[PDB]
Amino acid sequence: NAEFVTQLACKYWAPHIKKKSPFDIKVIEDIYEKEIVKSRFAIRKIMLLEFSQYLENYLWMNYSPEVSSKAYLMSICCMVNEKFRENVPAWEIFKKKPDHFPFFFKHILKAALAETDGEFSLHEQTVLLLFLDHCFNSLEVDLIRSQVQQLISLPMWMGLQLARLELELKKTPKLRKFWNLIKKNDEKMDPEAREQAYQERRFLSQLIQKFISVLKSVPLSEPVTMDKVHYCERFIELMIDLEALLPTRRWFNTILDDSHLLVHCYLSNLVRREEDGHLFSQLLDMLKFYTGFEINDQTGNALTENEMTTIHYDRITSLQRAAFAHFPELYDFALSNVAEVDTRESLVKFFGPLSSNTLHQVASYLCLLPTLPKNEDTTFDKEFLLELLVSRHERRISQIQQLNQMPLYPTEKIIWDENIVPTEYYSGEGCLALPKLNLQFLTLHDYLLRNFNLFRLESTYEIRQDIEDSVSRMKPWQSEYGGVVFGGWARMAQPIVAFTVVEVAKPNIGENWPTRVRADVTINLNVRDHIKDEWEGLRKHDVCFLITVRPTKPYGTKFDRRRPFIEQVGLVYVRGCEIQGMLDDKGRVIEPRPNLRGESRTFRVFLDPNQYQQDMTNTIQNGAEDVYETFNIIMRRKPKENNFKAVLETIRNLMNTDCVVPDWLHDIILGYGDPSSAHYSKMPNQIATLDFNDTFLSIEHLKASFPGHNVKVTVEDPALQIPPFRITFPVEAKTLIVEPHVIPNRGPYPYNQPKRNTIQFTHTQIEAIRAGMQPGLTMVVGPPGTGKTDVAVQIISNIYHNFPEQRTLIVTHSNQALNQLFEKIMALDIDERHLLRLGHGEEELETEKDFSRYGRVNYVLARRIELLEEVKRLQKSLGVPGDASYTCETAGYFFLYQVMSRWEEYISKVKNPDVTEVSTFFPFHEYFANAPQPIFKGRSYEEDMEIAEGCFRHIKKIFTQLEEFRASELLRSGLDRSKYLLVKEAKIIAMTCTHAALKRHDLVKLGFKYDNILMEEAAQILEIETFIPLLLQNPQDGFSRLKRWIMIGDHHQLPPVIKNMAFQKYSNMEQSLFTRFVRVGVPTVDLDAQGRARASLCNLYNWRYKNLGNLPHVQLLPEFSTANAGLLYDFQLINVEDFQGVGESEPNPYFYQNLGEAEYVVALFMYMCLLGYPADKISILTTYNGQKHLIRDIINRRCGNNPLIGRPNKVTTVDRFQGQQNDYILLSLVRTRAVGHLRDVRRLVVAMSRARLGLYIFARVSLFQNCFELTPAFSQLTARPLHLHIIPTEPFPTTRKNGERPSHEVQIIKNMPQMANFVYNMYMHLIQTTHHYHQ
Ligand SMILES: Nc1ncnc2c1ncn2[C@@H]1O[C@H](COP(=O)(O)OP(=O)(O)NP(=O)(O)O)[C@@H](O)[C@H]1O
Ligand SMILES: [Mg+2]
Ligand SMILES: [Mg+2]
Known part of the structure; x- marks a missing residue:
C-alpha cells in the first residue's frame, strides 16, 4: 500500500502541493490500524510516513484534546521515534505549537502505565518506553523539561516506602524543610491539580512495578513472546539513561533502590535464558554499574x-x-x-x-x-x-579496579556479539548494550569510560572484518588426522609455524595479574617478496591477532562469505598481541637493520596480562584447555587503522591519573553548570591591557573593529596613530584606550624589520582574536571560507609576542590544516627556531620550510655554524687575537667578557650627552661596516641612541641564539636534539589529534609543558581525541598549567568519521566535543564573511549560519562577477529522469550508481573541455563511492586517449572533499528511490560549498524537494530551470558578466541523451577543424 500512504499524503498533507483536503481524523485512525499496526510496525511504512512529513503537516498541527485518541498518541510517538532513528530534528513542530503538548504528554504517561495486554499491546507500550526515553534524554528542550520536571524532582519521593522516606530525611536533615515546603504548597492546590501532581510524582515508581510484573511473566524454559523480551530490554535502557544523568538520577536513584528492581532482575527467569535474555543481561550489567556509581547524589561530586x-x-x-x-x-x-x-x-x-x-x-x-x-x-x-x-x-x-582488570583486546566472545559489536546492517529498531554521548556525564570517570568502551567496541568491528576476510582467504580445511591445511593464502595473515610463551612476570603488589607476558611467534615467509617485505615491516607496538581455527569442512569445500564465519572456518580463539620486535640470528630483539637469511621469521610479542591471567585461571580452575598452545594463524593489520590499543591504553592511564584539568573547564567538560563561565569576560584573571601588535593595519581599521565602543587614543597627532597598537579594556565602560607604540629597533639592517600581518580582519574576526589572547575558553564557529586559518595564526602570533614565556600547543585533525597554518605562520614575525611539528612519518613535506624534528635540528645546526662565524668576525673587528673557532660555550664567555663590558662602558658614557658622542664612542663600528652607511644620522641624540641600542640588540640576539643552540653540542644524536626542541626551545608545537593520542605517554615522560592550546577542524575531531590534548603534561603545584583553550571549527559541516554507522545511530559516537559544547550553550564567535566563492554560490549554504555574508573582495572583484563560458547560469540543479528504464542502480549491494546522471556529468565535463576550460579547474563530486567509480569508468571509456579532453583534478565523494575546493564542481546526487545520507544537512552544506565559481548538480529533483531538511537549499536551486542552459558558441574564457543578457544563442538541453548527442557532434566538428598533439 505504498500507493495508499502516498496518495493520502498527496491529498491531505504532502509538501509542494498548493491545496489540500481539510483535516480528517479518520485518516489518522485508518493509517494507524491498517498501515502501521497491521504491517506489524514495518519500518518502511513508518519511514514513508515520516519522510512525507506526516508529523509536521498532519498529526501535530491538528492535535487537540478533543480529537486525541490511542491511534493519535501512538502515531505521534512513532514519528518522533523514527526521527531519532534517522537522526533528524525530532521536536521542532512541538516547539512551534506548544499549546497542547502538556495534555499530550500526560496521556502518554497514562498509556505507558495502562494495564498489560489491555488497551495497549506490549509492543505499543515498548514504543512508548522508547519515546519516553527520548524525552528524558532531551531535557535541553524547555517544552519537554517543563513536563518532565514533576516526574523526577524531590516530590517523586512520595513513591518511596514510608520508612525509607523517613530514613532519608534523617540521613539528610536539611531535606526535611524542603519536604515540608512541598507539602505546604500542595495545600494551595485544587483537588484535580493535586491528583495530577501525585500521579506524576508516582509515575516512575509505578512504571517500575509494571516492569517487574512483565518481567515475572517470562517463563524459564517454555516459549516466550519476543514482545515481553523487548519491553524488558527497552525498560533497562530507560533505567540506565535516567541513572546516568544527574538531574534524573538525583532523586530517582533512591526510588530505584527502594524498589529492589536490580535484585529482581538478577534472579529473573529472563537473565537465566542464555539466548533470549543475553541482551537483557548485558543491559543489566550496565545498569548495575550506574546504580552503584561512585557519586554523591546530592552534591554531584565523585566519591573518594x-x-x-x-x-x-x-x-x-x-x-x-x-x-x-x-x-x-x-x-x-x-x-x-x-x-x-x-x-x-x-x-x-x-x-x-x-x-x-x-x-x-x-x-x-x-x-x-x-x-x-x-x-x-x-x-x-x-x-x-x-x-x-x-x-x-x-x-x-571500585570502578578503577574494575577498569584495570579489563583486557585491551577483544576475544572471540566479543568480536561476533552484535549486541555490543553491531554490523552496519543495524536498523535501530532494537537497542544495544552501548554507552551514549549527548550533553552531560556524571563524573570524569563516567565521561572517560563511555569513550573508552565506545572506542573499544567500535574498533572491534573493523577487527571482525579484517579477521573474516584474511582467514577466509586462507581457506582452512580439514586434513588427516584431524589437522588443518590452508587451501589459500592471504596478504594480511600467515600460518603460525611455532608459538611459545617465554615470559610470565610476577604481579605488582596488589594487582592479581602478571606485569608482563611475552611470547615468541614464528612464521615461514614462503611468499612473494612484496609480502615478505611487509611482514618484515612490522615494528614495535604494532598489534597483531593470534587465531585458532579447527576447520569444519573437508578439503576443497567452497566458502560462502554470506554464511556465519565461525562455523565456516571453525573459529575457536582470538587473542591480541603487540610486537616487541623481530629476532635476529643472534637471538636479539631488533630495535642499520640486518639482512636475515632463510624464510623463517620469529617475533617476540606482548600478550595482554589480564587476558592471560583469566585464561590461566580458567584453565587451572575449570580444566579449560591452554589457549596459548593452540594458535595456528597470525594476522597483521594496516598501521593507520590499528591504533585502537594504544588509544585505549592512553584513556585508561588518564583514568588512573588525577586528571587535573583547569577548574574553570571541569564543569563545562562534564556538560553541566554555566556554559559561559569560561568566557574571557568572566575570567577573574582577564588581562586589562593587550598589545595587538600588527593586528590592525591602521587606526581606522582599529576603530572599525569595535562598532559598539568609544576609542580614545593616548596621542592626538594623527601621524603617530599608526600600528602597532596597545588596547586597554575597562572593568563610559564602552571606552577603549588605544596606545600606539614603536617597535624596538632591531639593528642597522632595514631588512631585519619584522614581517607584518596584511589581513584586514573584520570586527567579528577581531572578537575571536581578542578572545584567544585572553585566559579562558574561546570557541570560534567558522563557516566555509570565513578565514579560520588567518584568525588562528593571528592569535598564535599575538600570544607569541605578548607572552614570550608561554608555549602554545596546536592540534588539528589533518596534516593539511597544519600545512596551511605553517604556511601563514611563515609570513609573520615568528622565528622559525621557535617552531616545531610532530608527526609519525615519512609525511610529504608541503611547506617551504621543514618544521619536523629533522628539519628543525638541521636548521639549528646550520644556524649555529653561521652565528659562530659572526662571533669570529666580531672578535676580529674588535682587534682581539685568536685563531681558534668559537663554540657556543666560548661564544658565551666572549659575550660577557668582550661584548657586555664594551657596551656597559659605552652606556656609562653616553647614557648617564651629544649626538656626536653616540657615534664617537660606539664600540662596534667595524663589525657593522657591511651594513648600509652611515649607521648614525647625527640629527638628534634620541634617534642615534636608539640606533645604537638596536645594534646591540642585533648582536645580543646572535648570542641568545647560540646559548639556546649549546644543547646541540651537548647532545649528539638527532633524537636527543629533537627532545631539546620539544621540551625547551620551541614556543609553538603542532601535531594532529591522532599523533597526540599515540604520543601522550612519551610526552608526559619527557616533561612536555605548554600553556595554551589552539585547535582547528575541531568539529571533525572525536570527543575523546579532543579531551586528550588537554593532558599532554603533568599538573603544576596541583593545578593544570593550561591558561587558554581555543577551538576553531564548524559543527554545520561534517563530523568525525565513524566506520560503522551503527555506533552513530545508537550512541551518537560521531559527536565532537566542539559540537557538544555548542549544544551545551558555550558562547561562540561566529565568523560572518567568506572570501573564496561567489556570493550567489554562498547563498546555497549561508542560510545555515548566523549572519553569514561576504567579504568586500568577493563582492567587488571582477573574477567573482564573470560568468562561466558556455553556461548561462553560474549554478544549476539539473533534473535527470530514467535512462533505459533505470534510475538508481546497485550492481553490488550498497554500491549505488546512476548511469543517467554519470553519463550526463561526464558529457558536461567534455563539453567544458571542448570549450577550452582548464580541465584541472574542474572537479567531480558525488555522494556515493559506487557512482564515483562509475564516473571514473566513463571518463576512461569516453575520453580515453582524447587530446582535446583532459582529466578533472579529482573524481571523488563529497565526504572525501572536505576542506577542499575547485573553481568548478560537477555534482551527482545519484538517488531516485530514497534520499539517503544527504538528508544530513551537514553533508548538504559541504556539498554546496566546494565550488568557487561554478556548481552544477545532477539529481532526481522531485525526490530531494520532498525532504524537509533540504528545503532551504533546494528551494533556491529550483528557482532556476532544471534543464541545462548552454551557450556553445562562447569559448572559455569569456568576458560576459553574471547578470548581462548573453550575445550568443542559448540552447536548452532537456536530457542526458540530447547532451551526449550534442557533445559527440561538437567533438566530431572539432576533430575535423583542429588537431592537438601530446605524446
Ligand atoms: N578579514 C579578511 N579580509 C580580507 N581577506 C580575508 C579576510 N579573512 C579571510 N580572508 C581571505 O579569504 C580567503 C578565504 O579564506 P580561507 O582560508 O580559504 O577560509 P578558511 O576558514 O581559513 N578554511 P576553509 O573554510 O576551508 O576555506 C583567504 O584567502 C583568506 O586569506
Ligand atoms: Mg528549546
Ligand atoms: Mg582551512
Whole structure:
C-alpha cells in the first residue's frame, strides 16, 4: 500500500502541493490500524510516513484534546521515534505549537502505565518506553523539561516506602524543610491539580512495578513472546539513561533502590535464558554499574575511596546494630569485625541458614521492606530476601579496579556479539548494550569510560572484518588426522609455524595479574617478496591477532562469505598481541637493520596480562584447555587503522591519573553548570591591557573593529596613530584606550624589520582574536571560507609576542590544516627556531620550510655554524687575537667578557650627552661596516641612541641564539636534539589529534609543558581525541598549567568519521566535543564573511549560519562577477529522469550508481573541455563511492586517449572533499528511490560549498524537494530551470558578466541523451577543424 500512504499524503498533507483536503481524523485512525499496526510496525511504512512529513503537516498541527485518541498518541510517538532513528530534528513542530503538548504528554504517561495486554499491546507500550526515553534524554528542550520536571524532582519521593522516606530525611536533615515546603504548597492546590501532581510524582515508581510484573511473566524454559523480551530490554535502557544523568538520577536513584528492581532482575527467569535474555543481561550489567556509581547524589561530586569505604562500613554497622538488638541467631555476626563479615561468602554463611521470615524481619529493620506482622509468613522468596541483604552489604571493588582488570583486546566472545559489536546492517529498531554521548556525564570517570568502551567496541568491528576476510582467504580445511591445511593464502595473515610463551612476570603488589607476558611467534615467509617485505615491516607496538581455527569442512569445500564465519572456518580463539620486535640470528630483539637469511621469521610479542591471567585461571580452575598452545594463524593489520590499543591504553592511564584539568573547564567538560563561565569576560584573571601588535593595519581599521565602543587614543597627532597598537579594556565602560607604540629597533639592517600581518580582519574576526589572547575558553564557529586559518595564526602570533614565556600547543585533525597554518605562520614575525611539528612519518613535506624534528635540528645546526662565524668576525673587528673557532660555550664567555663590558662602558658614557658622542664612542663600528652607511644620522641624540641600542640588540640576539643552540653540542644524536626542541626551545608545537593520542605517554615522560592550546577542524575531531590534548603534561603545584583553550571549527559541516554507522545511530559516537559544547550553550564567535566563492554560490549554504555574508573582495572583484563560458547560469540543479528504464542502480549491494546522471556529468565535463576550460579547474563530486567509480569508468571509456579532453583534478565523494575546493564542481546526487545520507544537512552544506565559481548538480529533483531538511537549499536551486542552459558558441574564457543578457544563442538541453548527442557532434566538428598533439 505504498500507493495508499502516498496518495493520502498527496491529498491531505504532502509538501509542494498548493491545496489540500481539510483535516480528517479518520485518516489518522485508518493509517494507524491498517498501515502501521497491521504491517506489524514495518519500518518502511513508518519511514514513508515520516519522510512525507506526516508529523509536521498532519498529526501535530491538528492535535487537540478533543480529537486525541490511542491511534493519535501512538502515531505521534512513532514519528518522533523514527526521527531519532534517522537522526533528524525530532521536536521542532512541538516547539512551534506548544499549546497542547502538556495534555499530550500526560496521556502518554497514562498509556505507558495502562494495564498489560489491555488497551495497549506490549509492543505499543515498548514504543512508548522508547519515546519516553527520548524525552528524558532531551531535557535541553524547555517544552519537554517543563513536563518532565514533576516526574523526577524531590516530590517523586512520595513513591518511596514510608520508612525509607523517613530514613532519608534523617540521613539528610536539611531535606526535611524542603519536604515540608512541598507539602505546604500542595495545600494551595485544587483537588484535580493535586491528583495530577501525585500521579506524576508516582509515575516512575509505578512504571517500575509494571516492569517487574512483565518481567515475572517470562517463563524459564517454555516459549516466550519476543514482545515481553523487548519491553524488558527497552525498560533497562530507560533505567540506565535516567541513572546516568544527574538531574534524573538525583532523586530517582533512591526510588530505584527502594524498589529492589536490580535484585529482581538478577534472579529473573529472563537473565537465566542464555539466548533470549543475553541482551537483557548485558543491559543489566550496565545498569548495575550506574546504580552503584561512585557519586554523591546530592552534591554531584565523585566519591573518594574513603567515602566509599565509610558508606560500606556504615551499612554493616547498622546491620550489626539490628542484629545485636533483635536476632540472637546473629549474635556472633553482630560482634565480629567488619572485614570478617562483609564478604559475599561470609554474608551467605551468616544469613543463608536463616528462615525467610527472619530475613524479611532483618530487611524491615533496615527500612528495606514493610514489617512482617506477628505470626505471618513472608510472601517473598528466600533467594530474593537473601540476595537483597547480601548484595546490599557485600564488599565492592571500585570502578578503577574494575577498569584495570579489563583486557585491551577483544576475544572471540566479543568480536561476533552484535549486541555490543553491531554490523552496519543495524536498523535501530532494537537497542544495544552501548554507552551514549549527548550533553552531560556524571563524573570524569563516567565521561572517560563511555569513550573508552565506545572506542573499544567500535574498533572491534573493523577487527571482525579484517579477521573474516584474511582467514577466509586462507581457506582452512580439514586434513588427516584431524589437522588443518590452508587451501589459500592471504596478504594480511600467515600460518603460525611455532608459538611459545617465554615470559610470565610476577604481579605488582596488589594487582592479581602478571606485569608482563611475552611470547615468541614464528612464521615461514614462503611468499612473494612484496609480502615478505611487509611482514618484515612490522615494528614495535604494532598489534597483531593470534587465531585458532579447527576447520569444519573437508578439503576443497567452497566458502560462502554470506554464511556465519565461525562455523565456516571453525573459529575457536582470538587473542591480541603487540610486537616487541623481530629476532635476529643472534637471538636479539631488533630495535642499520640486518639482512636475515632463510624464510623463517620469529617475533617476540606482548600478550595482554589480564587476558592471560583469566585464561590461566580458567584453565587451572575449570580444566579449560591452554589457549596459548593452540594458535595456528597470525594476522597483521594496516598501521593507520590499528591504533585502537594504544588509544585505549592512553584513556585508561588518564583514568588512573588525577586528571587535573583547569577548574574553570571541569564543569563545562562534564556538560553541566554555566556554559559561559569560561568566557574571557568572566575570567577573574582577564588581562586589562593587550598589545595587538600588527593586528590592525591602521587606526581606522582599529576603530572599525569595535562598532559598539568609544576609542580614545593616548596621542592626538594623527601621524603617530599608526600600528602597532596597545588596547586597554575597562572593568563610559564602552571606552577603549588605544596606545600606539614603536617597535624596538632591531639593528642597522632595514631588512631585519619584522614581517607584518596584511589581513584586514573584520570586527567579528577581531572578537575571536581578542578572545584567544585572553585566559579562558574561546570557541570560534567558522563557516566555509570565513578565514579560520588567518584568525588562528593571528592569535598564535599575538600570544607569541605578548607572552614570550608561554608555549602554545596546536592540534588539528589533518596534516593539511597544519600545512596551511605553517604556511601563514611563515609570513609573520615568528622565528622559525621557535617552531616545531610532530608527526609519525615519512609525511610529504608541503611547506617551504621543514618544521619536523629533522628539519628543525638541521636548521639549528646550520644556524649555529653561521652565528659562530659572526662571533669570529666580531672578535676580529674588535682587534682581539685568536685563531681558534668559537663554540657556543666560548661564544658565551666572549659575550660577557668582550661584548657586555664594551657596551656597559659605552652606556656609562653616553647614557648617564651629544649626538656626536653616540657615534664617537660606539664600540662596534667595524663589525657593522657591511651594513648600509652611515649607521648614525647625527640629527638628534634620541634617534642615534636608539640606533645604537638596536645594534646591540642585533648582536645580543646572535648570542641568545647560540646559548639556546649549546644543547646541540651537548647532545649528539638527532633524537636527543629533537627532545631539546620539544621540551625547551620551541614556543609553538603542532601535531594532529591522532599523533597526540599515540604520543601522550612519551610526552608526559619527557616533561612536555605548554600553556595554551589552539585547535582547528575541531568539529571533525572525536570527543575523546579532543579531551586528550588537554593532558599532554603533568599538573603544576596541583593545578593544570593550561591558561587558554581555543577551538576553531564548524559543527554545520561534517563530523568525525565513524566506520560503522551503527555506533552513530545508537550512541551518537560521531559527536565532537566542539559540537557538544555548542549544544551545551558555550558562547561562540561566529565568523560572518567568506572570501573564496561567489556570493550567489554562498547563498546555497549561508542560510545555515548566523549572519553569514561576504567579504568586500568577493563582492567587488571582477573574477567573482564573470560568468562561466558556455553556461548561462553560474549554478544549476539539473533534473535527470530514467535512462533505459533505470534510475538508481546497485550492481553490488550498497554500491549505488546512476548511469543517467554519470553519463550526463561526464558529457558536461567534455563539453567544458571542448570549450577550452582548464580541465584541472574542474572537479567531480558525488555522494556515493559506487557512482564515483562509475564516473571514473566513463571518463576512461569516453575520453580515453582524447587530446582535446583532459582529466578533472579529482573524481571523488563529497565526504572525501572536505576542506577542499575547485573553481568548478560537477555534482551527482545519484538517488531516485530514497534520499539517503544527504538528508544530513551537514553533508548538504559541504556539498554546496566546494565550488568557487561554478556548481552544477545532477539529481532526481522531485525526490530531494520532498525532504524537509533540504528545503532551504533546494528551494533556491529550483528557482532556476532544471534543464541545462548552454551557450556553445562562447569559448572559455569569456568576458560576459553574471547578470548581462548573453550575445550568443542559448540552447536548452532537456536530457542526458540530447547532451551526449550534442557533445559527440561538437567533438566530431572539432576533430575535423583542429588537431592537438601530446605524446
Ligand atoms: N578579514 C579578511 N579580509 C580580507 N581577506 C580575508 C579576510 N579573512 C579571510 N580572508 C581571505 O579569504 C580567503 C578565504 O579564506 P580561507 O582560508 O580559504 O577560509 P578558511 O576558514 O581559513 N578554511 P576553509 O573554510 O576551508 O576555506 C583567504 O584567502 C583568506 O586569506
Ligand atoms: Mg528549546
Ligand atoms: Mg582551512
